[PDB]
Subunit: 246 residues, 6 copies
């Protein structure tokens, strides 16, 4: 499995939440590996869009060192009918069942389910397939850890899937001026002086931006002349904030 | 039929409800076997998710000692169209009809019917097949006991299926501190001292957790260091409770 | 045609309604046989679930002594598409049209129409086929009596089918303590003493239970020890009553 | 074309409405035959169920003496898909277009359109086919009179079809005690004395029963002993009345 | 192209609106022919049912003298699936694109789109095809004038098609007693004396009848005896009026 | 790729917004070309209908000088099923992925998605394909800039697509009398004197017309006699304004 594809810009420790996600992930891996009572363990990584769910799921899977690791993604099922998706999924789980210790990542569940809020509309046959697969224990003695990711926990709850996962792990956006500065420093993009200015403008204030989104705002800001990079970054950050009124 | 698959962690007598379910199940088995008036008997085991419905249904079926016993599960029908499911079901009942005394378990009815609350949506052709099969007597002189399971009695009622079953048996979650401790003791997971602490924290208080869910919380708690296992268990139990406001 | 299959436990005269149903049925048979003005006569037997509609329809058909008698049932059309059901129905009526005097029973119309209250949903193509067949006179000079059965008169009315039948015959549940005792006596299940006790508990009081449902409650009660059979029967009857508030 | 099939019990002159329907029908036939301006004329016979629409349409068509006369009925299209019905209809009109003077009866439009009030549901492809055919003039110089029938004028109006017909002719139920007695006398069913009694009970009072329905009530009443025939007829008439409150 | 088929009863100048429609049509033809900036021009002729939209569209197209003129009509697509209609349309436009100067009439858009107000229902694939075709310029240097007709401008607006047309031309019903008399005179149907009477009854009063509908009322009135023709005409006109309350 | 087809009447600098759109477009092109962090950049050009979105998107793409440039348009997918559209799209992106630096324009998204406000209705399979493609990075090291266009930003937001684009660029209609005059002058259509008159009538006043729509109004006005061209233009502009009440 190619993780570089799912962890294109590493896993930077911008804040304690990152460590929490990884540590809780390892606990589930350990449980899956050593428990006879629960040979099947499932966890849903959920949070706001762009918070870093897919990369963290891939990282947890990578760190498991399991003999079988497979990531189920919407990427190679574009245009697939409900039945075709179900068959592709059954194939992945069937292969996993042949391993003594396996990890399957079901990435971007709302996309796998062809979900759209207007209606709403979605592929029920695929939803039903997942509900069954999430509860199906591998052959006696074999173990499986299923890691799902979503930016729509609310929808999955309404679909009664949230109750199918053993547990869920929240993957929050960067939420404080300090976490933001930590991310910038670890990413090493602005000049020492520019970060001091940014810190002056954000420290103490609340922020709400996903790590993936932060990468984009940084690159956009860097296209500006040196004198305007910080101004541009702060303006973009101002537009990518959380609605005070919702 | 492989029951070990459906009764992976035994049938522990955590409380009187367990005995009630099994005893009422045996009465229905006896009626099916000895009655000429009602050669067809059906019962719906229903309760909250994870309360132990499938395992108990499998146990009732196993204890019947009937020459023909078959469990109809969503597991091998993932991605199946409505028609395909109906044919798979007709096959099972047709085989049952060839036996003088048979028991068919129709497990996880909401999943067999591809039910989802959003809409709602479901496979009506499959619902109709079940409504007919639940009322169809085997060839004259032959007997059949149908045992269905569901975590959604309300939905089946609205579908007018609840009225198709001869009777229903409630499979409750563990509901008292005493039943909880009994389960823990029978499962033998915590140290004698740890259970005393748990008893101190739960005795007298109300609880509402399904046996299957309890197994998961236990295993999660055991991944903690010895000094933190009880704290973790109680915290998880606190999150898996019933909403006081609904 | 096998009536034993549709009249598994006879036709007991538990009350005057039974005689009324049969007498009105014979009048329609006579009209169909002797009228030149109305060579096509249709009647809908309707009532609460389990009231005995199918058995009575089969009995009316049997007593007609017509050269052609066929019962159209959902039993052999499980999983059938709308088109497949329509073709199966057309076949039955086409065969009937070849006879000078025929009777076709269209049993469990809500099931033939794949009806479910959620939505609601149903097979309109099948509904339309029935609406046409109910009004189609056999070849000139030939006669046909169509007997339909349903537990959902309200739904058929809304579908404008009720207006397609020549008339309807109500098949009520047992409604008085006296009719209940008459049924028990004719079925001869309890000891002379046990019926006196039951009579003491129900006489004068209102009841509302279908004959088919009564058979089931009796058999369930008989699985109890002799000393507890009556207590069990009365408890079950108490649960199978009509809602005072609806 | 077999009219005997569509006019099984003649066309009795029970009241002035019958003459009106036939006279207006002949005027349309005359217009279709002699007009160069309107080579295509369409008329919708509409009224309550059982009022005699189909028989009158067939009679108007028969009296036209047109070289081409065809009745399009739901009878031979049971189970037909929308496309199949459209093709069957196109065939009839295509044949009509080959005649210099033709009459096509489109009978029971609500049934041809697979209409049901629940939803509602209907075959839009068939509706669209009719909307186009109702407005399509035959080849230059050729003439066509289209006669449709329905018991649901309201629905056709909502479908914007009512506006596609050149005009409509109301086919009312028998509405007065005098028209009722006239029908009975012309049908010659009761004894001279029995009609005097009926007249005594209905004269001056309002009635609302379709001629086809009247035929059925008469036959049902005749199955009674001589002394009870009138009582039965009046009781049935009492149940087949119009709701004072709707 | 056969215009006689679409202009069966000529184009009479009953009022100024007729001249306006034709003059505005010619301006669009001229623009299409001489403009390099707008090689693609589209216009929607819209008005009440029977106002004469199709005939006027055909007339505008005929007067263009364009080397390629094609009328797309629902007439030869009865029973066609959405895909089949789209292909038929693509064929017409593809042929038009091969001409240096073309005119395509898309007649009765609501019928091409299988529109019905109940639901509503319509063929979205066909709507989408039209939305694209209405905005697609012919190969560089080639010109195309698209003329659509509809009696449902409101619906097309809601479908966002009205915004796809370059402009729209209103085709009103005859709206004044004077325009009505002008039409009658040009059609030359009543006796000189009869028109004086009609004028006496309508002059000064408002009217609202489509030219096509007027043709029908005239022919119906002519089927009456000479003494009753005017009375009949006025009575029919009275029924074909506009609702004062809507 | 043929841009002349998508930029039929050039890109005139009628106002500062035009320069803004092009400059922001170039910044995104530069970012796509030089960034390692964001190899995938997407931008949605959105604005009122006819504001010039497609031409500007094509211009931004043309100015990128990328080795691979492809415009995905609804034009060659008329009548295509959802699956067929998805396959056509996958083909374009797959080809783009083979290039080191590519630009794909996804034009008229509401049309690609078969969107209609009534219902609403749309092709969810196509929407899902776009949601995945908008987030899929090209093979490691390769770069892709996706430029979408729409006149319905609101709808895309509700579909959660707006959140899939890296950013959006507003393409406004001409909004001031000065911008209008600048457009007219650059297009060089009216006589020096006529523009002075127009300026007199619009200067200081607000306007809201898309450049593409302006081209049409100009051509329509030019079909008038010299003395009436300005009057016609102003009248048309008066009808193509923004609703003060919405
Ligand atoms: N601590 C971190 N956690 C997660 N991703 C990180 C972290 N540090 C850097 N990244 C990078 O940030 C990006 C996160 O993208 P991704 O994992 O696709 O987000 P996502 O929340 O799954 N997106 P979406 O599914 O679009 O909401 C990847 O390029 C990661 O390599
Ligand atoms: N008394 C008991 N009753 C039922 N299951 C028990 C009992 N004691 C232990 N178990 C175990 O608990 C688990 C119950 O799981 P299961 O029977 O699948 O629950 P369920 O309620 O059918 N689940 P779901 O269908 O997901 O709501 C099995 O592993 C059983 O072996
Ligand atoms: N008087 C009676 N009328 C009808 N059935 C009777 C009577 N006496 C005994 N029975 C028996 O009671 C049973 C009635 O079952 P059935 O005719 O299937 O009921 P139903 O109302 O058609 N059921 P459902 O369609 O499930 O509502 C049969 O076994 C009959 O033989
Ligand atoms: N004056 C009459 N008008 C019409 N039918 C008549 C008349 N006199 C006798 N009849 C008979 O009455 C019956 C009318 O049935 P039919 O024409 O099918 O009614 P309908 O209104 O079309 N029925 P439906 O379509 O079920 O509402 C036929 O048998 C006719 O022969
Ligand atoms: N000035 C006129 N304008 C239009 N049609 C005219 C005129 N004078 C006479 N006619 C005739 O009136 C008829 C109009 O019919 P048509 O053009 O089909 O109307 P329409 O409004 O398109 N109908 P519909 O689509 O059913 O609303 C044709 O027979 C024309 O020849
Ligand atoms: N500054 C400009 N920006 C955009 N288009 C321009 C400009 N100047 C001239 N044009 C021309 O104006 C027309 C714009 O049409 P187009 O780009 O299709 O608009 P659109 O907003 O994409 N249309 P739609 O998709 O129908 O809302 C083209 O012919 C352009 O060549
Ligand atoms: Mg992700
Ligand atoms: Mg279960
Ligand atoms: Mg029945
Ligand atoms: Mg009829
Ligand atoms: Mg027209
Ligand atoms: Mg565009």
């Amino acid at each position: 499995e190619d993780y570089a594809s799912y962890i294109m810009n590493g896993i930077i420790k911008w804040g304690d939440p990152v460590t929490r996600v990884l540590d809780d992930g390892e606990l589930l891996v350990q449980q899956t590996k050593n428990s006879d009572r629960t040979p099947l363990v499932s966890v849903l990584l959920e949070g706001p869009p762009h918070s870093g769910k897919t990369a963290l799921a891939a990282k947890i899977a990578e760190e498991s060192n399991f003999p079988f690791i497979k990531i189920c993604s919407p990427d190679k099922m574009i245009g697939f009918s409900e039945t075709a998706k179900c068959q592709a999924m059954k194939k992945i789980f069937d292969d996993a069942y042949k391993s003594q210790l396996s990890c399957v990542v079901v990435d971007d569940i709302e996309r796998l389910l062809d979900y759209v809020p207007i209606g709403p509309r979605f592929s029920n046959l695929v939803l039903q397939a997942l509900l069954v697969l999430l509860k199906k224990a591998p052959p006696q003695g074999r173990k499986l850890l299923i890691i799902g990711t979503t930016s729509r926990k609310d929808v999955l709850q309404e679909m009664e899937m949230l109750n199918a996962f053993s547990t869920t792990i929240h993957v929050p956006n960067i939420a404080t001026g300090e976490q933001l500065l930590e991310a910038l420093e670890l990413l090493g993009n602005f000049k020492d002086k520019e970060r001091t200015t940014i810190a002056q403008q954000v420290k103490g204030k609340k922020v709400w931006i996903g790590i993936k989104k932060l990468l984009m705002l940084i690159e956009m800001s860097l296209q500006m002349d040196p004198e305007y990079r910080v101004r541009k970054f702060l303006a973009l950050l101002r537009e990518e904030g959380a609605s005070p009124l919702d």
